């Protein structure tokens, strides 16, 4: 061969997988995710295809879901830091049934003029927020009394999800898998480089994925391993299913004095009949959606297998479907969607809630005045396998489930991978440097 000599090159387009922090970006305008500090979005972002190069994607290793997990919780706690403690409101409640029982009409006597202007301030309380005192009437008190000090969320904080974007830092790039058939992992062929991702709204829910993206012209079902009962099945829907939710009760609210310079909002009277929360779901769209899902499930789980039975498994907040329409947390019985194996949902409202899990300090929602209405659609859902059974293709009871809230972002992040680019490299050449 030729006498070869070392030549140094810079700008070499090669890279290695790496994990780092992506910068937030937002369509700039006390909403939790509406941080005062965030990069304005690019009105004309670029995307280029590699084509000579493929890349190994694995949605179960995208560490970006961890960044979102921690940052989102931090933003929640920060916005709701200067909020009102319920500590002096642990006073026992003399409760009777509210005439029309999920709502009790109770009284108490605290603080009784501890350098302030206060009184008994009777009010309405929800069953799901209190603990019975079986040694009394039965009487009630705040369920938090024997656990922790919790605060009433600041009335000035909105909880509307914001579609936050995330962009690569210098020296790093975001690769995207554009294969319509891409599942949990593999050598994605259609790979492109993206300057910055689209916005993902931090929607928090249990059992069904709401207001997300749609599948590429068919239902696509993903899992780490369809044979492993310890894994979950992620279903991305071809078209979404329409759901319309309402809180028909027109509620008032009252500010009460709890100390000098301190106020607390209580549920006031209710105007009109007291009715149940519920959501209306189109059976047509729901059933047709299921048809496509079943067809795909057959590919792995058998051609005559009975699927989709009633809700079961986990504590009440896992067994019920959960969402936060209007700022109030609704827990509805999804069984009405899965009450027939191979639509109006009854629903209750809770105010003392836990953002995915909370230790010690927790959030109590304020009462919302008026009526709550919203509209959304099911764009995905999580199925769980019921466990061991006869191998024969008889049953596989894909119950709704999933309590790991991180999957509400992983379900979108699966498209992306972050790498570190190494511009420095060498190769042989023909001649020696003309060294004197």
């Amino acid at each position: 061969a030729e006498q070869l000599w070392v030549t140094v090159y810079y700008g070499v387009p090669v890279w290695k997988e790496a994990t780092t922090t992506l910068f937030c970006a937002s369509d700039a305008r006390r909403n939790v995710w509406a941080t005062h500090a965030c990069v304005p979005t690019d009105p004309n972002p670029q995307e280029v295809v590699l084509e000579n190069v493929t890349e190994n994607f694995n949605m179960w290793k995208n560490n970006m879901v961890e960044q979102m997990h921690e940052d989102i919780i931090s933003l929640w706690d920060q916005s709701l830091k200067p909020c009102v403690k319920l500590t002096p409101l642990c006073v026992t409640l003399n409760c009777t049934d509210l005439r029309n029982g999920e709502i009790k009409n109770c009284s108490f006597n605290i603080t009784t003029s501890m350098r302030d202007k206060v009184q008994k301030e009777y009010a309405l309380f929800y069953k799901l927020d209190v603990v019975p005192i079986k040694n009394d009437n039965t009487s009630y008190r705040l369920i938090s009394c024997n656990t922790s000090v919790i605060t009433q969320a600041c009335p000035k904080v909105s909880f509307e999800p914001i579609p936050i974007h995330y962009c690569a830092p210098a020296g790093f790039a975001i690769l995207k898998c554009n294969d319509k058939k891409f599942n949990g992992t593999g050598p994605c062929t259609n790979v492109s480089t993206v300057q910055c991702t689209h916005g993902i709204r931090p929607v928090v829910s249990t059992q069904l994925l709401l207001n997300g993206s749609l599948a590429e012209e068919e239902v696509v079902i993903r899992s780490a391993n369809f044979t492993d009962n310890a894994k979950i099945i992620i279903v991305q829907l071809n078209k979404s299913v329409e759901i319309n939710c309402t809180r028909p009760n027109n509620n008032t609210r009252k500010s009460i004095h709890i100390g000098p310079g301190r106020w607390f909002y209580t549920t006031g009277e209710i105007i009109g009949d007291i009715r149940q929360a519920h959501c209306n779901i189109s059976g047509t769209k729901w059933n047709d959606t299921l048809k496509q899902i079943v067809v795909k499930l057959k590919e792995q789980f058998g051609n005559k297998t009975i699927v989709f039975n009633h809700s079961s498994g986990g504590d009440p907040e896992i067994v019920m479907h959960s969402f936060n329409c209007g700022g109030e947390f609704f827990y509805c019985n999804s069984t009405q969607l899965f009450n027939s194996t191979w639509i109006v949902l009854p629903c209750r409202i809770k105010q003392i809630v836990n953002m995915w899990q909370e230790v010690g300090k927790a959030m109590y929602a304020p009462p919302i005045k008026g009526q709550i209405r919203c509209s959304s659609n099911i764009t995905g859902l999580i199925l769980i396998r019921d466990g061991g059974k006869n191998r024969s293709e008889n049953t596989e009871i894909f119950r709704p489930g999933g309590g790991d809230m991180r999957d509400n972002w992983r379900s979108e992040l699966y498209k992306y991978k972050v790498v570190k680019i190494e511009p420095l490299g060498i190769a042989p050449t023909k001649c020696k440097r003309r060294v004197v």
């Binding site: 070392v6 030549t7 090159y9 810079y10 670029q46 511009p423 190769a427 060294v435």
Partner: protein
Amino acid sequence: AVGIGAVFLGFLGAAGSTMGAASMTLTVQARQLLSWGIKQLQARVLAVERYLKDQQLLGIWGCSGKLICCTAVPWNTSWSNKSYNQIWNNMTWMEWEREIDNYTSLIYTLIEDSQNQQEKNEQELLELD
């Protein structure tokens, strides 16, 4: 008849084409790579350190200002016995870097310990006499 793109390589695409063809856009790729508050502040400092690290080596090696510079270190064919054309017209940057990944520190050391050392010693001697 030929269909054409606009101007030049978008970003990294050449990584899977031969190193010969890929060399055309080193100016593009280099420029693009070279160039809440606290987390970003940390990232900025890290970017600077990575930036300067590369500049340090390019300075020492006598390569500063160039994206292509010839050294005076001979190629030891033990690393790879491929000819010039067998590499440059037949192998990509991603593939090449892997082939000689385990010689990176070796050759980098040789550039500094042998050539740079020589160039600085002899330079002074030539300036003196």
